[PDB]
Design a protein around this ligand. Sequence first.
Ligand SMILES: O=c1[nH]c(=O)c2nc[nH]c2[nH]1
Ligand SMILES: O=c1[nH]c(=O)c2nc[nH]c2[nH]1
Lengths: 272, 272
Amino acid sequence: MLTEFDAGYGEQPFRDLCANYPGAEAYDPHDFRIEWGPIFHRGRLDGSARVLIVGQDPAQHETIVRRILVGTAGRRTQGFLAKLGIVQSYVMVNTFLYSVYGQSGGSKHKNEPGIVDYRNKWFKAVLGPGNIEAVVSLGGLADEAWKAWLKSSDGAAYKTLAYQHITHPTWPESSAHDSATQAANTKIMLAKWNAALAALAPEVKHPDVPTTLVPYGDAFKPSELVDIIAKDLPAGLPAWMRGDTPWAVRQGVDAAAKRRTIMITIPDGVIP
Amino acid sequence: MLTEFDAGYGEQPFRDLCANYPGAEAYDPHDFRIEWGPIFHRGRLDGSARVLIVGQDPAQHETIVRRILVGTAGRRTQGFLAKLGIVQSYVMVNTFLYSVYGQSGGSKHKNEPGIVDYRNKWFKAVLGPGNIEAVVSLGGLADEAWKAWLKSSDGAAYKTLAYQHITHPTWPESSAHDSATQAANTKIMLAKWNAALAALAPEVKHPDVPTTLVPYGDAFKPSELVDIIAKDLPAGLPAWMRGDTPWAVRQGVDAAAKRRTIMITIPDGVIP
Ligand SMILES: O=c1[nH]c(=O)c2nc[nH]c2[nH]1
Ligand SMILES: O=c1[nH]c(=O)c2nc[nH]c2[nH]1
């Protein structure tokens, strides 16, 4: 009858990190959805994490759960980790605290000191315990974020740490709308992902589950889409918030109204 | 620029309480909104609480914030405590972990062992430090909840503790729709609230701010409506979620759709 949960940011240095976060002085209130407040991480902050994930920016599901990467992008990432034998021993952090409000106008402010400095503080903290043995960045901006981190004083000691830059999980659906082109690019992604998994498997010497590598096909299998674990969510959040069915979307008659609203809908089958 | 927050349930005995909570085996899944998961509390759990508030059941605002009494009822309660000099030294718990559906019935189940046993555990925990000097129940069901606690072995030792049953803060708008009856019923409530404050002022000997009691008039004044404090909310939640303007409602084309959906709308003025 036991249900696990994440108990948040009560221990240092995370406690101070979450009380002194940057707002409109670092993140432009127009090009960033700072109106929803910062979503900080996902995963273990007790030091048991073995792989670090660097994502890009949060979406609307994350805006409700208050943990990053809990949508479709997250479930694809869970399956990627599962292939390495990693089931719970991970920590994820985003390139941006807030969501980009574009227009994909994310790279417009990638050089803001107030933004990079604060992210580096989170990198310094999660890497501090020295237990991370692999780092994976999602997309090109996370890639630039990690590489800019290794060029800083505090991060210079991680140039040797196993690292793979892979394509952002939502690239196929972001690059085209036709199911045909989307399916073709997915095959291209899964092929590139297979190359990264082969390079990381020998570096991950402490998996939650010993696992022989099984590569992706041309398309995703349902088993390669893994639900977020209960242990990642705050206390009390229902099981369907970490299920396979979408439940949050932005809704508005125009752009101004759509930005101001998130609609939450419980999947069918929960309520008798 | 420091923003405080509640870091949840990482310390015992609360950690185990939030990992082993009751579901459909104690709360009937039709007469209770268990689909949204449990909302546990609001306030201090470090032992600095001086006043215990016992509420009834959570609403749609609480379902997003994941703390109880953050809606209009909560803001009226804040102002009630503010008159006793209490600004942050409090802890609040609901009679039910979930929000009844309806209802109609709403009290069919007030005596279910699976419900009361678990609530008593939360009572025992918050009261353990022996720092609570006054208890206030909201509504008739919260009143019976406290009385059921005093009839238990572990709770018999609190029959001596100063206690006041006041009317549930959202009763006037619950009793009638015409603004005339609402204003009339409010006057009756504020009269009963003033009666409770007269009885509790000498019992609250450890206020965060020494304050001379100012009784209510015939209607609520803007100053007697106090916004929930940042320290009560999880890390990252934006300031407007603890503002004076409603931003959450259940909405649907029929009863079934309304139960499955919550609408979140950012107040005007937040986004530039
Ligand atoms: O937290 C997130 N990080 C991401 O990189 C991303 N992409 C889509 N959705 C996302 N959520
Ligand atoms: O947490 C809550 N407890 C209550 O008793 C209540 N009444 C209205 N809204 C409420 N929220």
